[PDB]
């Protein structure tokens, strides 16, 4: 399809998905001496309703927690946005070892994993599908995860993994507010960018927290224990799913702080 292996992975994605060398590609390195101040940035506000949580799914390259997105029970507003965005999903990226799992980097530093909390512009568009290709259609919070102490907010998430071990398995995942995973400071950087895997649409406004959150070495072990194959086939552990950083191509990263 496309994947993270040497034959189908990120360096190879341009053959099928030419926008991979576009001008608004995500995974970037944020250089802090080159970010620009902005006084127009509002604080980021999140208000999610735990009753929107729906399901956890093993999609083969990764795993996702989907939320009901039929109404505005769970929205992101403020920051750079005038439209309120509707939460639809969160998931993680991680690497083969502790040294490099994050997608975004800050002054060259690689963290051990990265949380993404994804939203779509429901003031302009009527569905995620319509929003997903539009320049202003997606909003995504990225949070860097620094290996150290066990993070207890991950518990419900990590305990659900044993029920979705192989590709395609899914299960109810209910009554959960993913604003509990966020850092306590909500200082951020913003830039215009992309989905970090195929289709790779340039549709995302990224919100990168300044503050990392923790994760233990054993908690990263549980993510890597997930299986990319379908039940019954030989076990093939999901060892990594992070893309290399991409050239800014003249874009400005703005800091809120
Ligand atoms: Cl994903
Ligand atoms: Zn590999
Ligand atoms: Zn995915
Ligand atoms: Zn992601």
Swiss-Prot record:
Active site: 61 (proton donor/acceptor)
Enzyme Commission numbers on file: 4.2.1.1, 4.2.1.69
Residues that coordinate or bind substrate: 196-197
Region of interest (Disordered), residue spans: 1-27, 237-257
Broad enzyme group: lyase
Keywords in alphabetical order: Acetylation, Cytoplasm, Lyase, Metal-binding, Zinc
Domain of life: Eukaryota
Any single Pfam family the record assigns to this protein: Carb_anhydrase
Activity regulation, free text: Activated by histamine, imidazole, L-adrenaline, L- and D-histidine, and L- and D-phenylalanine. Inhibited by coumarins, sulfonamide derivatives such as acetazolamide, benzenesulfonamide and derivatives (4-carboxyethylbenzene-sulfonamide, 4-carboxyethylbenzene-sulfonamide ethyl ester, 4-(acetyl-2-aminoethyl)benzene-sulfonamide, 4-aminoethylbenzene-sulfonamide), and 'prong inhibitors' BR15, BR17, BR22 and BR30. Activated by a short exposition to Foscarnet (phosphonoformate trisodium salt), but inhibited by a long one. Esterase activity weakly reduced by cyanamide.
Bridged cysteine pairs (disulfide): none
Domain Alpha-carbonic anhydrase: residue ranges: 1-257
Reported cofactor(s): Zn(2+)
Swiss-Prot/TrEMBL catalytic activity: hydrogencarbonate + H(+) = CO2 + H2O; urea = cyanamide + H2O
Positions bound to Zn(2+) 2: 61, 64, 197
PANTHER family on file: CARBONIC ANHYDRASE, CARBONIC ANHYDRASE 1
Summary of the function given for this chain in its UniProt record: Catalyzes the reversible hydration of carbon dioxide. Can hydrate cyanamide to urea.
Name used for this protein in its record: Carbonic anhydrase 1
